[PDB]
Amino acid sequence: SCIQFTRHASDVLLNLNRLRSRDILTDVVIVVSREQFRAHKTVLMACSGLFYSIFTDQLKCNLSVINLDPEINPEGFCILLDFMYTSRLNLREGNIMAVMATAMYLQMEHVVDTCRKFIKAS
Amino acid sequence: SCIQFTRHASDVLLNLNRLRSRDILTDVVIVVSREQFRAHKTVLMACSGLFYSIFTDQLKCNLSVINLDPEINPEGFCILLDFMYTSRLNLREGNIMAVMATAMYLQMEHVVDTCRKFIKAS
Amino acid sequence: WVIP
Amino acid sequence: WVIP
Numbered sequence: 001s002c003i004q005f006t007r008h009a010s011d012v013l014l015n016l017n018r019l020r021s022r023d024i025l026t027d028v029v030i031v032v033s034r035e036q037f038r039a040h041k042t043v044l045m046a047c048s049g050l051f052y053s054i055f056t057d058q059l060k061c062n063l064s065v066i067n068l069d070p071e072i073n074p075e076g077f078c079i080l081l082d083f084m085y086t087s088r089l090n091l092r093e094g095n096i097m098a099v100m101a102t103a104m105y106l107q108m109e110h111v112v113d114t115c116r117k118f119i120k121a122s
Numbered sequence: 123s124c125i126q127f128t129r130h131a132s133d134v135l136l137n138l139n140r141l142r143s144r145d146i147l148t149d150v151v152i153v154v155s156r157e158q159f160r161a162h163k164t165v166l167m168a169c170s171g172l173f174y175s176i177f178t179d180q181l182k183c184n185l186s187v188i189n190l191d192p193e194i195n196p197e198g199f200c201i202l203l204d205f206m207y208t209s210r211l212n213l214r215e216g217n218i219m220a221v222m223a224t225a226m227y228l229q230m231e232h233v234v235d236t237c238r239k240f241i242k243a244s
Numbered sequence: 245w246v247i248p
Numbered sequence: 249w250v251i252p
């Protein structure tokens with residue numbers, strides 16, 4: 001018999017993104033080639049099958065630095081990290097291949113699905 | 123020119139609640155009278171003006187235990203913590219006064235607004 | 245607020 | 249997915 005506030009989840013995610021932009025309570029650095037990205041482990045886990053596996057591991061859960069596979073493109077990662085914190089995906093002709101490959105590696109099934117759909121159309 | 127995944131914020135919050143139920147990456151205990159509640163500091167901050175103030179404080183940001191005012195009812199807190207992680211508010215005739223008082227203390231303005239509306243109707 |  |  002609960003009532004529901006429609007905008008609550010969106011407002012929570014917006015505040016988590018504000019914390020990210022101000023570098024508040026970020027507890028991990030994701031290293032992609034030369035580039036470094038600060039984030040919240042819980043948000044990464046909530047969005048990605050790969051980060052979920054990493055941070056539920058009894059040894060890796062305690063690491064402050066995570067290095068991604070050298071094949072991962074920093075721009076593709078940046079676009080996906082923005083999507084995690086906003087629900088908005090900056091998908092473009094020039095980045096779609098790098099975004100799909102990064103989403104497959106990060107195990108973000110809904111992003112992989114839209115990339116496959118957009119590629120098929122062209 | 124971004125695209126948006128409508129269900130993303132809700133899915134993120136659902137996974138954060140799953141992490142909470144399994145006590146994964148919880149980094150704070152909220153003490154309310156004799157009762158203890160484990161949570162994620164970032165989620166508390168995203169939902170509450172009070173926790174936002176507490177965890178942006180350079181000294182309090184590092185505390186693993188937070189004790190609430192002794193006037194706060196554990197059940198009212200529990201209902202509000204559930205709302206933070208689900209968007210669902212278990213508002214009932216027998217708990218509405220304790221929920222409104224706890225939401226005013228936690229600075230959860232949308233919950234305070236619905237409690238004031240529901241009280242006015244009765 | 246809605247009835248979910 | 250939608251156009252926001």
Ligand SMILES: O=C1Cc2cc(Nc3cc(Cl)ncc3Cl)ccc2N1
Binds near residue numbers: 137141
């Ligand atoms: O495409 C995806 C997105 C995703 C997210 C998560 N994260 C969780 C899943 C569960 Cl059941 N509980 C808690 C968490 Cl944080 C796992 C796999 C995948 N795959």
Ligand SMILES: O=C1Cc2cc(Nc3cc(Cl)ncc3Cl)ccc2N1
Binds near residue numbers: 016
């Ligand atoms: O009723 C409310 C809910 C709420 C949430 C937050 N939390 C934030 C606000 C901003 Cl601007 N950036 C980041 C955060 Cl985590 C503050 C005040 C209130 N009042």
Ligand SMILES: [Cl-]
Binds near residue numbers: 047109110111
């Ligand atoms: Cl996804």
Ligand SMILES: [Cl-]
Binds near residue numbers: 233
């Ligand atoms: Cl609220």
